[PDB]
Amino acid sequence: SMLEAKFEEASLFKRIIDGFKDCVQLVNFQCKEDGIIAQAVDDSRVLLVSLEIGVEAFQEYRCDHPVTLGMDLTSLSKILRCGNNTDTLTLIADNTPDSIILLFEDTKKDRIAEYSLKLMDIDADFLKIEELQYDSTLSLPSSEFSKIVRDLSQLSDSINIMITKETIKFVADGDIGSGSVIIKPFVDMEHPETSIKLEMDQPVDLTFGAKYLLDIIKGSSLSDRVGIRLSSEAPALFQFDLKSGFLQFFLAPKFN
Amino acid sequence: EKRSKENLPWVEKYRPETLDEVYGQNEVITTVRKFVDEGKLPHLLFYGPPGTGKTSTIVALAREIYGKNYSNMVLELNASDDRGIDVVRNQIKDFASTRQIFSKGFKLIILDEADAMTNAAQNALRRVIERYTKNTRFCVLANYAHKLTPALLSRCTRFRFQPLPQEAIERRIANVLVHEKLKLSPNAEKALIELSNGDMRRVLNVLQSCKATLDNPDEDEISDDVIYECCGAPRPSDLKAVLKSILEDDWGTAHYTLNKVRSAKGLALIDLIEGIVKILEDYELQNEETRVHLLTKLADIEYSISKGGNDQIQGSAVIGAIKASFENET
Amino acid sequence: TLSLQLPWVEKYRPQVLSDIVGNKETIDRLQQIAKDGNMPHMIISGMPGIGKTTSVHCLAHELLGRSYADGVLELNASDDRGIDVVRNQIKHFAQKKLHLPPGKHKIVILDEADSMTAGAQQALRRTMELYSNSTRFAFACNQSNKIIEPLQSRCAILRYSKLSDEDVLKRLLQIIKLEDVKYTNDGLEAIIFTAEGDMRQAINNLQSTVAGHGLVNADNVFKIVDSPHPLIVKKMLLASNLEDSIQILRTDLWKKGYSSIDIVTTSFRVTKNLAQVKESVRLEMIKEIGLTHMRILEGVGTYLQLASMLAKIHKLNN
Amino acid sequence: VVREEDKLWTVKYAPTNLQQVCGNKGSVMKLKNWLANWENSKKNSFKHAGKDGSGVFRAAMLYGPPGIGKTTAAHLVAQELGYDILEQNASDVRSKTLLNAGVKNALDNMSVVGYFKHNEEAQNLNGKHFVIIMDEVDGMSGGDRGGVGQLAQFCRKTSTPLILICNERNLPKMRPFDRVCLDIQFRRPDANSIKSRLMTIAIREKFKLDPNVIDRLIQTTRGDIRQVINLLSTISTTTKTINHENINEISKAWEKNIALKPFDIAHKMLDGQIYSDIGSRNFTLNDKIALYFDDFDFTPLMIQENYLSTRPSVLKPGQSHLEAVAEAANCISLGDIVEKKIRSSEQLWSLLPLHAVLSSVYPASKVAGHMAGRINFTAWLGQNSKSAKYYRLLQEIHYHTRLGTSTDKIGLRLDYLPTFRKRLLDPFLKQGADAISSVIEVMDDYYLTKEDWDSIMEFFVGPDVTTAIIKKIPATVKSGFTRKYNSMTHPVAIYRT
DNA sequence: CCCCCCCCCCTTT
DNA sequence: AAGGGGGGGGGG
DNA sequence: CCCCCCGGCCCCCCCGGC
DNA sequence: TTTCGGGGGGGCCGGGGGG
Ligand SMILES: Nc1ncnc2c1ncn2[C@@H]1O[C@H](COP(=O)(O)OP(=O)(O)OP(O)(O)=S)[C@@H](O)[C@H]1O
Ligand SMILES: Nc1ncnc2c1ncn2[C@@H]1O[C@H](COP(=O)(O)OP(=O)(O)OP(O)(O)=S)[C@@H](O)[C@H]1O
Ligand SMILES: Nc1ncnc2c1ncn2[C@@H]1O[C@H](COP(=O)(O)OP(=O)(O)OP(O)(O)=S)[C@@H](O)[C@H]1O
Ligand SMILES: [Mg+2]
Ligand SMILES: [Mg+2]
Numbered sequence A: 001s002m003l004e005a006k007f008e009e010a011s012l013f014k015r016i017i018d019g020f021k022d023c024v025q026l027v028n029f030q031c032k033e034d035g036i037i038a039q040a041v042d043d044s045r046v047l048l049v050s051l052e053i054g055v056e057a058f059q060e061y062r063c064d065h066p067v068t069l070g071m072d073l074t075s076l077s078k079i080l081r082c083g084n085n086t087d088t089l090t091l092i093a094d095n096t097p098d099s100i101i102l103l104f105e106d107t108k109k110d111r112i113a114e115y116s117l118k119l120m121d122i123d124a125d126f127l128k129i130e131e132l133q134y135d136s137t138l139s140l141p142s143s144e145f146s147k148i149v150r151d152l153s154q155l156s157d158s159i160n161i162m163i164t165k166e167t168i169k170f171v172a173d174g175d176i177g178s179g180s181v182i183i184k185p186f187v188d189m190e191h192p193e194t195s196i197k198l199e200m201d202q203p204v205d206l207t208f209g210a211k212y213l214l215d216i217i218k219g220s221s222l223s224d225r226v227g228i229r230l231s232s233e234a235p236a237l238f239q240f241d242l243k244s245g246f247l248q249f250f251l252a253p254k255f256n
Numbered sequence B: 001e002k003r004s005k006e007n008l009p010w011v012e013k014y015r016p017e018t019l020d021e022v023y024g025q026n027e028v029i030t031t032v033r034k035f036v037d038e039g040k041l042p043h044l045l046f047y048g049p050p051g052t053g054k055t056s057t058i059v060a061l062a063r064e065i066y067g068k069n070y071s072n073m074v075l076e077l078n079a080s081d082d083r084g085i086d087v088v089r090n091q092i093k094d095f096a097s098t099r100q101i102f103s104k105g106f107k108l109i110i111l112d113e114a115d116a117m118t119n120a121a122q123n124a125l126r127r128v129i130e131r132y133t134k135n136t137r138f139c140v141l142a143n144y145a146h147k148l149t150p151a152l153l154s155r156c157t158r159f160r161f162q163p164l165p166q167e168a169i170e171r172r173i174a175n176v177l178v179h180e181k182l183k184l185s186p187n188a189e190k191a192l193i194e195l196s197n198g199d200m201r202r203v204l205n206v207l208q209s210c211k212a213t214l215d216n217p218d219e220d221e222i223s224d225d226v227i228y229e230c231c232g233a234p235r236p237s238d239l240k241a242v243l244k245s246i247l248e249d250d251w252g253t254a255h256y257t258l259n260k261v262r263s264a265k266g267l268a269l270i271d272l273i274e275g276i277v278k279i280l281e282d283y284e285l286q287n288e289e290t291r292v293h294l295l296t297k298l299a300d301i302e303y304s305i306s307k308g309g310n311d312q313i314q315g316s317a318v319i320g321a322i323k324a325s326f327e328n329e330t
Numbered sequence C: 001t002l003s004l005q006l007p008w009v010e011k012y013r014p015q016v017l018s019d020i021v022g023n024k025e026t027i028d029r030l031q032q033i034a035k036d037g038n039m040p041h042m043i044i045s046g047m048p049g050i051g052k053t054t055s056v057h058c059l060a061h062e063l064l065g066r067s068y069a070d071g072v073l074e075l076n077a078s079d080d081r082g083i084d085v086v087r088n089q090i091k092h093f094a095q096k097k098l099h100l101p102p103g104k105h106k107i108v109i110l111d112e113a114d115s116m117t118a119g120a121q122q123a124l125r126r127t128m129e130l131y132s133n134s135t136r137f138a139f140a141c142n143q144s145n146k147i148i149e150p151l152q153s154r155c156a157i158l159r160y161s162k163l164s165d166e167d168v169l170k171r172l173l174q175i176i177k178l179e180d181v182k183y184t185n186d187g188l189e190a191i192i193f194t195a196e197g198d199m200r201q202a203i204n205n206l207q208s209t210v211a212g213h214g215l216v217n218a219d220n221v222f223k224i225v226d227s228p229h230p231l232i233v234k235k236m237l238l239a240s241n242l243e244d245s246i247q248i249l250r251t252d253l254w255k256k257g258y259s260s261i262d263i264v265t266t267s268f269r270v271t272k273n274l275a276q277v278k279e280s281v282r283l284e285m286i287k288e289i290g291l292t293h294m295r296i297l298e299g300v301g302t303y304l305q306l307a308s309m310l311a312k313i314h315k316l317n318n
Numbered sequence D: 001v002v003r004e005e006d007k008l009w010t011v012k013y014a015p016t017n018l019q020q021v022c023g024n025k026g027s028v029m030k031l032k033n034w035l036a037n038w039e040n041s042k043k044n045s046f047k048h049a050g051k052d053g054s055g056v057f058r059a060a061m062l063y064g065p066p067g068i069g070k071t072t073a074a075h076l077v078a079q080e081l082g083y084d085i086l087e088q089n090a091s092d093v094r095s096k097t098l099l100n101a102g103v104k105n106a107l108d109n110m111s112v113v114g115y116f117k118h119n120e121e122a123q124n125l126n127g128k129h130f131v132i133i134m135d136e137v138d139g140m141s142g143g144d145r146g147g148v149g150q151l152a153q154f155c156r157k158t159s160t161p162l163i164l165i166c167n168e169r170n171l172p173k174m175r176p177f178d179r180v181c182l183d184i185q186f187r188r189p190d191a192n193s194i195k196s197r198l199m200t201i202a203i204r205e206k207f208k209l210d211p212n213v214i215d216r217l218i219q220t221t222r223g224d225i226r227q228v229i230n231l232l233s234t235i236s237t238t239t240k241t242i243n244h245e246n247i248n249e250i251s252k253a254w255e256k257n258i259a260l261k262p263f264d265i266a267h268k269m270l271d272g273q274i275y276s277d278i279g280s281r282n283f284t285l286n287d288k289i290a291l292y293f294d295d296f297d298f299t300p301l302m303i304q305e306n307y308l309s310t311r312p313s314v315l316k317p318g319q320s321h322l323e324a325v326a327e328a329a330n331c332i333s334l335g336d337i338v339e340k341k342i343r344s345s346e347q348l349w350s351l352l353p354l355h356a357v358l359s360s361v362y363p364a365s366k367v368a369g370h371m372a373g374r375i376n377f378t379a380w381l382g383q384n385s386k387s388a389k390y391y392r393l394l395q396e397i398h399y400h401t402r403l404g405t406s407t408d409k410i411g412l413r414l415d416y417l418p419t420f421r422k423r424l425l426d427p428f429l430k431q432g433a434d435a436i437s438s439v440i441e442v443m444d445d446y447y448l449t450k451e452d453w454d455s456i457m458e459f460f461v462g463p464d465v466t467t468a469i470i471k472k473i474p475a476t477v478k479s480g481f482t483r484k485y486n487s488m489t490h491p492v493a494i495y496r497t
Numbered sequence E: 001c002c003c004c005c006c007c008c009c010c011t012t013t
Numbered sequence F: 001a002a003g004g005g006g007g008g009g010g011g012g
Numbered sequence G: 001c002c003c004c005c006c007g008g009c010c011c012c013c014c015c016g017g018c
Numbered sequence H: 001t002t003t004c005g006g007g008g009g010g011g012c013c014g015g016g017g018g019g
């Protein structure tokens, strides 16, 4: 088996999958000697999910040659639900692969559950996510962003984010009036996790859909803070760090 | 059931329990017996008219194959149960694709009265029959072949149940008279066979009614008079007299004779028409037009009677039709 | 007694494309496709028991070798084939990734596809189009008109014709040799005559004989197999005199147990397919037969009604 | 990774450029012009229509028979103008809920894939836009509830170009798309427009194809290029020469069976040629019954509608047109009785063939010939609906006046209504506005209303038609009548009707 | 720009 | 070989 | 104590010949 | 158009289980 990646507990992989399972259907995983990079595009072709998991997140990682695996997330989640969170989860794939093996092993009861998931043929090529000089680079706690987004979505289906000098406005102008939430760059020493920073280059103003933001903010469980990179005319970048790796959402802004 | 078999109707009390008690179908019985005795039973399609022994034959075959516990080793479905496409997809498929519970053996499925099943279910049954032929066999019973899809008919070996021959009916009547302490005259047996039209149910029901009619069945013999009284059917002499009067007397005399013959025993006009048609079938007419007119007008009168209407007008119509048709002989 | 024996129809089901008789051009085309691969989307149509399912299965087996288990998705009327099934399971199978030799593809076999609803057929279109590089579709049906035009446009039409008497005789003789069956020429003639081009019925009757009487002669065949009643009805309708028609009706149909509804329906069909009689005369006879059929459906299923129908038909043909 | 010789010929030889498309050049040009100028129309809010008239529609509806290049044309147009394609088809659930939760968000959103693919591309302004292609809209079965209406709203309200594709534009289900999209029609391409493509395919695949028999092949597939390419691929496996010798057999084997529509069924059934001896030999009675079954709910209506408008060529010696018409009418009446039997509680659908003979085939054979004029659709459906509406109105009027009269609804129609008119309409034509009160009184005596007044006035026929009479009444009189009625209380016969 | 075949497609709940 | 309307090859 | 999964009615629509 | 019956497919509702 060229590819053998062991997660000490299946909980981590389950949380990672659940983070971006309500917005995409098919994922392409490229596994190389340096780890796993996964890409996904939603049906509407508006949201792009990228995932990076380094070799530090696995107890034992071995990859003789790079491999590509197309997975449907419904089946993957269904199979993952069959393994307890306290078992070690081994992902196994051999040369010329038609399926991937998920092995949930528990040494406490010497119980081994082996599942085989058939791979999907995806012809889409990995979009080149080249570094972009985003105009604004904000970062704020995941809980606060989730609360604000969920509160604003109840009023309007579109949320407008404006970044100006020491001003971050989330307007929700829609059918139910027009509510706004304003936060300022704030720093605390007792609990630095609740600090808000702003590193603009030019003023920014982008409008996004409510459904995409609601799907994106579902990943707050995997990170304590969320980093938002914005540019005058380009997709936003919502980054959630992990113990070893990251989960990024690229959302195409609404027109004007 | 309740109490004992003596409380059952004769049509049910005398239901064959073994293939040796099925009369009048010697070829089919022999073929099926040879098939079972050599382990080469194919899918069966028993096609026949009412009361010929199809259900009895298949039940006896299942009993012979599986013994007394056959009821728990076969899947019997009839028009009284739901047999939709979902039933075929789930219940029949599960039965055909699973092993026996009580004892080892092959699976038998009896789709009695399969002519009452929808076309969709019949189509779904095709691959069920084809795929599980190794361990399952299907038997379907029908009275009307036009209701069965060609695909289903292609998959089944056909056995036709003819109307019961007269000798088989006599043998069954002899067995019944041996069981029930009864005496039957040859004329009574002849009339019973004539009116039965090859149906054993009719024979048994009429015999039971005849026995009930006798005052002292132990020492009273059933005669043709008893049969005609219980069945309320015209006697041959009455039909001959009516026909002779119609064909050889004036209109008033024919009307009077028909009315008197009908009133004497309270006969129905339809039975008289049937008897006269049977009598005239053997007549040798010199002109085809006479037969054509007879058949057409009598069929019209029978159809009119089927919907009710005035009885006297219908009788006069019968008389006039016969007279006009026979006027063409010249 | 409790151990069944495989019927000859299944025991001698052709396992290779070279064992199928009839439709020589189409069979050779299928053999060429198997040899060179690149199977196209196809629809095989015909009438019962001519070798459609056998041909499709043989082609799939020969093409896919040992990859038959994973590369073939078989669905028929006995399986649920609704719109949801087509959208989910068939789409997943088409999107599946499987490693096969250079000239092979995954195969979806929709047997009895005429039973599928219009919505499922509509849903199949873009699935067939987008994934043709890895999946191919083979439909087998009895009535091609049931398949919607868009699906027919995407497939290759293979309309099987009925097996000739020679092909039926050839296959029957091969089976006889492989089974060591005693037979006479007249017995084979009777078997083929009653088969009416249906291989399944021919083999079934051949087994029923021997299984019941040993020697396959015309007599023994006719003691179990009845001559097709459509031919008897045709003889009844074409009889010169009304007396002959009535005699045929009484002896060959009524006294044999055939129901009146069956007789009248067969009369309708035969009159519809009487090419030797003028169309107007056939229309008048059909009107009379329809009157009789309507009377029968009401409950008056008597021999007198059929006799009257024959009398009216003879009146028309005079 | 996919070998060239392992693809279907329809994929290997699929058009790569809009010029490679065969036939329907005008439709392709119309679609290209519509999409090219879509941005300008958006800038003008789709108010100033151009010379072509395509500037007012924000969406296009491509329709035509199968296998002619609609999907290929739409995809090539989308890719030629550097747009990003968002495609949905009948293989995707397209109900109201899913459409609202799906393509609706993308209707006014940018394309992340487009941005990340054309970031380095210069002068690609459309690369970040979406072109929504809704294929197989006609194939929306019960699995897509409300999809047609939601797509119609999308067409009437969208921010990016939207293209819809269907095969049957004349079906009632497609009515909502009547005037909310630019209709682009694709016609069966002729043989001359595809002969070069067939020659190229034959040369590339190493098999002889005679140019003469190409038209016969096109006729066999009825202008389906996909079907003809498939036929060539299937026949070339064993036959290396499609010449005049084998053309007949190939055409007869692959000939299509398209169910005729009601007008075509009526035209063919009434043709006198098929009922001749020879024509009977070619077109048989079974063929006629199958032609009826092609549409068994409209064929009898069409025959009954059009059997009086022909010039028979099958008249028997001495038989006149009127006698044949009478015989056909008698058989149509018998067929109507049979139809009543079929759709009764017994559900005797086994009589469907017999009905076919009594309602369609026999009368047509009696009056078969050449149509004397245009074939007309049945007028029975509209008349039936009108009769049902009038019967409903009569029932309401009867039950409003049921407490004053002594009769059934038929007696009310035949006897009471004339006197009611004489007491409700004539007074207005003699004393003008002085009858108002009197008329109202009459209404109050029978629990009548203004709507009942109009309905009653709408029943009379022949020399008692009130339309002109009502129209000629002075407007002042009618206004006064309405004001007087609306300014007074009236009794109610039935509460909560 | 105009005109003429030549055929196709639509009438239709 | 139904009547009426629309479109693309050829002549003008 | 509250939320989510997925079995069962409930409703609506469309054929029904060879 | 439509007098039953069957079949398919979608929308709710609610029992039960899980956290
Ligand atoms: N060949 C027979 N031999 C003896 N009794 C018979 C025979 N046929 C019918 N009967 C008698 O009539 C009764 C009914 O026979 P069945 O087997 O039910 O006939 P059937 O043909 O299956 O009826 P249908 O086709 O459903 S109306 C039996 O219980 C017997 O008593
Ligand atoms: N051309 C044939 N050659 C040899 N045997 C045949 C042939 N056709 C049919 N049979 C035999 O009959 C049996 C059934 O054949 P099938 O392939 O099932 O016919 P079919 O046309 O597919 O039936 P339908 O259309 O679903 S009713 C086979 O197992 C064969 O034994
Ligand atoms: N005008 C054409 N020219 C060349 N090839 C064509 C043309 N039209 C269809 N084809 C061929 O047929 C194949 C499929 O055609 P499509 O455009 O996808 O079908 P369609 O016209 O959309 O009809 P439906 O409604 O999908 S059946 C193309 O890839 C081509 O290979
Ligand atoms: Mg029975
Ligand atoms: Mg088959």
Ligand SMILES: [Mg+2]
Pocket: D070, D071, D072, D135
């Ligand atoms: Mg298409």
